[PDB]
Ligand binder design. Structure first.
Ligand SMILES: C[C@H](CCC(=O)NCCS(=O)(=O)O)[C@H]1CC[C@H]2[C@@H]3[C@H](O)C[C@@H]4C[C@H](O)CC[C@]4(C)[C@H]3C[C@H](O)[C@]12C
Length: 127
């Protein structure tokens, strides 16, 4: 399940991926500098996913898998999208953009992708 604290820390194609997502360089750079922290409370199909970034600014997110849900995209951008569950993976899709998240070896890891580049993430599990 996706539950407990997590420590986002090693990433790939981060700057290109965020630039394609459409993000300002100052926050791309400072976000990388700030090791991101994350926490999740899976709840029988419902979820309350949370983030802490660019100076640990907290943000809350939430959805039910299979259903469309509103997904804020930082204080500024926003979109609606469907979060999904293909067994262990927490699959998800967006207009012209896709990702899948997954727990492996009791670690939160993900395989995000956009435009024409991957974006693996790694986030150790902790409490
Ligand atoms: C890519 C987004 C921002 C990550 C971040 O913190 N970046 C640093 C700031 S910026 O980029 O540099 O501006 C994050 C913020 C909230 C995220 C969403 C929410 O956490 C809710 C779910 C969580 C699921 O595990 C994956 C799908 C998802 C629907 C997430 C997709 C994506 O990872 C989002 C939209």
């Amino acid at each position: 399940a996706f539950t407990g604290k997590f420590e986002m820390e090693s990433e790939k194609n981060y700057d290109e991926f965020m630039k394609l997502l459409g993000i300002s360089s100052d926050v791309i750079e400072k976000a990388r500098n700030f090791k991101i922290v994350t926490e999740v409370q899976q709840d029988g199909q419902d979820f309350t996913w949370s983030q802490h970034y660019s100076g640990g600014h907290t943000m809350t997110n939430k959805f039910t898998v299979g259903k469309e849900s509103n997904i804020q995209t930082m204080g500024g951008k926003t979109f609606k999208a469907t979060v999904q569950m293909e067994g262990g993976k927490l699959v998800v899709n967006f207009p012209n953009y896709h990702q899948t998240s997954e727990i492996v070896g009791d670690k939160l890891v993900e395989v995000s992708t956009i435009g024409g580049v991957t974006y693996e993430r790694v986030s150790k599990r902790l409490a």
